[PDB]
Structure 1
Amino acid sequence: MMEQVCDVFDIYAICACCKVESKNEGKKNEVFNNYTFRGLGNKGVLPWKCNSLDMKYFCAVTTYVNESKYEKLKYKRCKYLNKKKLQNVVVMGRTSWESIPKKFKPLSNRINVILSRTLKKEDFDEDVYIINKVEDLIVLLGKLNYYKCFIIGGSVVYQEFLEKKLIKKIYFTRINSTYECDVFFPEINENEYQIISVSDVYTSNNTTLDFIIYKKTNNDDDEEEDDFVYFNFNKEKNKNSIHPNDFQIYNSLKYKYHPEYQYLNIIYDIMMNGNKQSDRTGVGVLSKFGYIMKFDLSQYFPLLTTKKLFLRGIIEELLWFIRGETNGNTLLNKNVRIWEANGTREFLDNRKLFHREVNDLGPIYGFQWRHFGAEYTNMYDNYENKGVDQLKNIINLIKNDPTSRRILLCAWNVKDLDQMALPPCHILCQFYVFDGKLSCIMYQRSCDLGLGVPFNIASYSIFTHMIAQVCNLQPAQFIHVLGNAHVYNNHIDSLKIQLNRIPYPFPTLKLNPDIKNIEDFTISDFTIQNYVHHEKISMDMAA
């Protein structure tokens, strides 16, 4: 039918935006949305000054060319208008041109185009095209051999290319930190543009960042392809009549590379392919067996962004573990209620623990970490130098025998299981040290995907940081192994909502760096920075 200019000439935009220093009274319960990342410039320069990784990405996108795709674009552009090395075109406003240092101008291996009224060709020494209107560019592009055209900057330039409907896609970097800005990327209208791809999350220059792609919405061997269909002759409701169109946003994305998809894909897999089972009572799960997720802790802190999580509780839990404590009153006195239901009279009685005091959780994690194999008595007992201090041992092995394949911390004490309020969900941690870097595998026997797993990921990632620091190492991977992986029936609706949210780039965890012993951390040694998240979800929508 009819062909758009943005389509024929392959006009794209590429930008990087940070969060903006807009002061608000109560930065607890701050609303986040796509408009959160909108800061483009300050006093003529970049708000964050310099980001090596955003630069590298920018260079990669704007200089990438595929010579074999060219003749199809050539014919196409020629058809539209009736009619060595290939380069991309970069287009920028004069102000952006002048902010670039001389040593870097014109941009290497690219056709440089500058928009100006105040300056003409005679005002530039360099190999650049000077145009004075957007129409001039379109004329120029009909006359050039070039691969793609990128609009690289000036909010004035971005606004008018978007105003004029000349952008096919936006390559948009989300710099996950706050800086003083005076210039802003225009608000992308969600009826005009949808996010189709989200990259991995990275760290560079002391910020996390990721890269997203917005697309303009709907206004000598090939003989091997068929073999694929043959080898697939035995496949198959998928199994479960959850619905397709419920996950419209989830399924519309092409590249789902943000590490949060490791968790969100498992939900989807379980929902679509899970086995229907029933716990003791009449709950109510879909289940599967055996998954692995991996999170790169040197690049980000994997606190889920598709809903709001608070960490104070799980940090206090972790510190309680490290102290060796089994006293549930300690947590309740800090208003942490994680262990409360498992400490009641009724709960303990139903475990046949008739001689256990309320909130005495028995020889659980803390006790096993510090005193494995000692004879549990009560929560107030002084177990000094009894049983195996496996926490101190693993710290010693990591410091003194880093290549050991025996650095395991294990909570599953078979002799003690029946004395515990409940057997541990998190069975063991194994460590691995290469080149001054520490990775952790945690094996989980039982995994409530909806409510527990988001916190568990956070817990063990924090613990890996803690162990790395006191051992003088850098954290590398946290690797989460899931045994029995299940989604409660009563969570499904809430998880559907969640699956259709686009993740934000992850936050970062900072530890007070003065802490040199595992026993020395307190709650104020922990900071989650730049947590950007979708709204709080109640997993059970009961009322």
Structure 2
Amino acid sequence: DDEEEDDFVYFNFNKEKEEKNKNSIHPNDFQIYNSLKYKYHPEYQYLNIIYDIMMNGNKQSDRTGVGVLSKFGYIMKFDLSQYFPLLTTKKLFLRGIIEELLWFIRGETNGNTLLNKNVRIWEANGTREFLDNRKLFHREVNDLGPIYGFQWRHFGAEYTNMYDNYENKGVDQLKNIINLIKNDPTSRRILLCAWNVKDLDQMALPPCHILCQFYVFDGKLSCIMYQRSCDLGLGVPFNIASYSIFTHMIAQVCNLQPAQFIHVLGNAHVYNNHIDSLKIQLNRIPYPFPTLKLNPDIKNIEDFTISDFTIQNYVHHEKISMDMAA
């Protein structure tokens, strides 16, 4: 019944002649990547998006001036009941993103709290020069403004400075979604949003992880996070891990098991200076994923501390400095 085999060829009559070379990519650049027959390991959901952007991306300039290759709209899904999606084709550290997450939960906006623990994720965003560029001339260094944490715990409250007392001010979204998940699990309104249009300009920078939506079925919790801007080479690997850890935290404090972490990418881009490093990464074969364990004694979202998290059996390839100048 190969009849319909020719039919498949007909429907492809208007295909693009790739015989035409694009984005200055050399065939053997992806020799190993293209040599595998079946690439079913979940890390390929991330790797295939990078390959797609490199091969079909649009060359564009961007706010930073480095320039990028970008595409718009992708979705990745990781089955948290089967593994913890920490990329294995390069080495990744988690202490810093976990502290950032605990800091978000406390509702903090003080960049010094992270710096005193040697977590420098937000350091550049809080410098005198960076704040002045955002025209936040009357903002103290490292006072990030009403970013993630402030919106998760006080959406709508008037922001003054990072040392003010905001207890009971604004909407405590985090508290509300936990209550909805526990008491009205089939609600379709279980969302946590950081994109407060009114406060954007007061923020050191507008948020990239716009919102998180939750879904509960048969005692299992799934989460969708929408990211408006995604640095595939450097940010995305950490973003996958942060939200996968957050999903486990919420699930646990609500007496549910984590199911899927669904990542929706809006402006997905590969920075021109990460191209060589990514060519190397894509030719590396993933190792089985590690697992994440949380101290079972923690029953409330606010009681987690850094020692309550453990990553086990993490097998990975050697670190890679994404920067060409690195």
TM-score of the alignment, normalized to the shorter chain, above 0.5: yes
Structure-2 separation of matches of 1:226 and 1:374: 64
1:18-67 CA distances to partner (integer Å, 9 max, x unpaired)? xxxxxxxxxxxxxxxxxxxxxxxxxxxxxxxxxxxxxxxxxxxxxxxxxx
- What secondary structure does 2:311 align onto? strand
Structure-1 separation of matches of 2:61 and 2:8: 38
Shift in CA distance, 398/496, structure 1 to aligned 2, threshold 3 Å: same
- What secondary structure does 1:536 align onto? coil
Structure-1 separation of matches of 2:65 and 2:182: 49
- What secondary structure does 2:259 align onto? strand
Q: Which moved more, 1:305-314 or 1:235-244?
A: 235-244
1:371-397 CA distances to partner (integer Å, 9 max, x unpaired)? 000001110111010100000000000
- The corresponding residue for 2:12 is 232
- What secondary structure does 2:198 align onto? coil
Structure-1 separation of matches of 2:283 and 2:213: 34
Q: Which moved more, 1:273-282 or 1:325-334?
A: 273-282
Between 1 and 2, higher relative CO (CA 8 Å, sep ≥ 6) is seen in 2
2:317 equivalent to 1:528? no
Structure-2 separation of matches of 1:328 and 1:229: 58
- The corresponding residue for 2:27 is 244
Post-superposition shift, 1:455? 0.1
2:114 equivalent to 1:334? no
Structure-1 separation of matches of 2:262 and 2:65: 32
1:98-125 CA distances to partner (integer Å, 9 max, x unpaired)? xxxxxxxxxxxxxxxxxxxxxxxxxxxx
User: Which of 359, 370, 388 is the equivalent residue of 2:142?
Assistant: 359
Structure-2 separation of matches of 1:425 and 1:280: 14
Post-superposition shift, 1:438? 0.1
Structure-1 separation of matches of 2:54 and 2:91: 22
1:474-525 CA distances to partner (integer Å, 9 max, x unpaired)? 0000000000000001001000000000000000000000000000000000
Q: How does 1:192-207 map to 2 (within 5 A)?
A: none
Post-superposition shift, 1:542? 1.0
Structure-1 separation of matches of 2:202 and 2:63: 20
Structure-2 separation of matches of 1:316 and 1:531: 20
Between the two proteins, what is the percent identity of the paired residues? 100
Shift in CA distance, 438/281, structure 1 to aligned 2, threshold 3 Å: closer
Post-superposition shift, 1:295? 0.2
Structure-2 separation of matches of 1:303 and 1:360: 31
Query: Structure 1: where are the runs of 5+ without partners?
Result: 1-220
- The corresponding residue for 1:208 is none
Post-superposition shift, 1:226? 1.1
Post-superposition shift, 1:257? 0.3
Structure-2 separation of matches of 1:240 and 1:224: 35
Structure-1 separation of matches of 2:269 and 2:173: 30
Post-superposition shift, 1:446? 0.1
Shift in CA distance, 528/295, structure 1 to aligned 2, threshold 3 Å: same
Query: Normalized against structure 1, the TM-score is what?
Result: 0.59
Post-superposition shift, 1:240? 2.3
Structure-2 separation of matches of 1:236 and 1:283: 29
- What secondary structure does 1:415 align onto? helix
- What secondary structure does 2:74 align onto? strand
Post-superposition shift, 1:233? 1.2
Post-superposition shift, 1:283? 1.4
Structure-2 separation of matches of 1:491 and 1:392: 39
Q: How does 1:296-445 map to 2 (within 5 A)?
A: 296-445=79-228
Structure-2 separation of matches of 1:394 and 1:282: 39
Structure-1 separation of matches of 2:274 and 2:41: 23
- Report runs of 4+ in structure 1 exceeding 2 Å deviation: 237-241
User: Which of 250, 253, 256 is the equivalent residue of 1:467?
Assistant: 250
Structure-2 separation of matches of 1:223 and 1:243: 36
- What secondary structure does 1:478 align onto? strand
- What secondary structure does 2:89 align onto? coil
1:256-280 CA distances to partner (integer Å, 9 max, x unpaired)? 0000000000000000000000013
Structure-1 separation of matches of 2:253 and 2:28: 49
1:287-323 CA distances to partner (integer Å, 9 max, x unpaired)? 0000000000000000000000000000000000000
Post-superposition shift, 1:281? 5.1
- What secondary structure does 2:321 align onto? coil
Structure-2 separation of matches of 1:450 and 1:388: 35
Structure-1 separation of matches of 2:138 and 2:284: 48
1:66-107 CA distances to partner (integer Å, 9 max, x unpaired)? xxxxxxxxxxxxxxxxxxxxxxxxxxxxxxxxxxxxxxxxxx
Structure-1 separation of matches of 2:52 and 2:22: 11
1:207-260 CA distances to partner (integer Å, 9 max, x unpaired)? xxxxxxxxxxxxxx1111111121111111853221221111100111100000
- What secondary structure does 1:316 align onto? helix
Cα RMSD (Å): 0.9
Shift in CA distance, 373/536, structure 1 to aligned 2, threshold 3 Å: same
Q: Which moved more, 1:236-245 or 1:343-352?
A: 236-245
Structure-2 separation of matches of 1:541 and 1:489: 9
Shift in CA distance, 261/422, structure 1 to aligned 2, threshold 3 Å: same
Structure-2 separation of matches of 1:279 and 1:475: 37
- What secondary structure does 1:479 align onto? strand
Post-superposition shift, 1:448? 0.1
Structure-2 separation of matches of 1:282 and 1:420: 21
Post-superposition shift, 1:541? 2.8
Structure-1 separation of matches of 2:63 and 2:49: 24
Structure-2 separation of matches of 1:447 and 1:255: 27
- What secondary structure does 1:465 align onto? helix
1:349-376 CA distances to partner (integer Å, 9 max, x unpaired)? 0001001100000000000000000001
Give 1 or 2 for the bigger CA radius of gyration. 1
- What secondary structure does 2:137 align onto? coil
1:443-488 CA distances to partner (integer Å, 9 max, x unpaired)? 0000000000000000000000000000000000000000000000
Structure-1 separation of matches of 2:203 and 2:139: 10
1:145-186 CA distances to partner (integer Å, 9 max, x unpaired)? xxxxxxxxxxxxxxxxxxxxxxxxxxxxxxxxxxxxxxxxxx
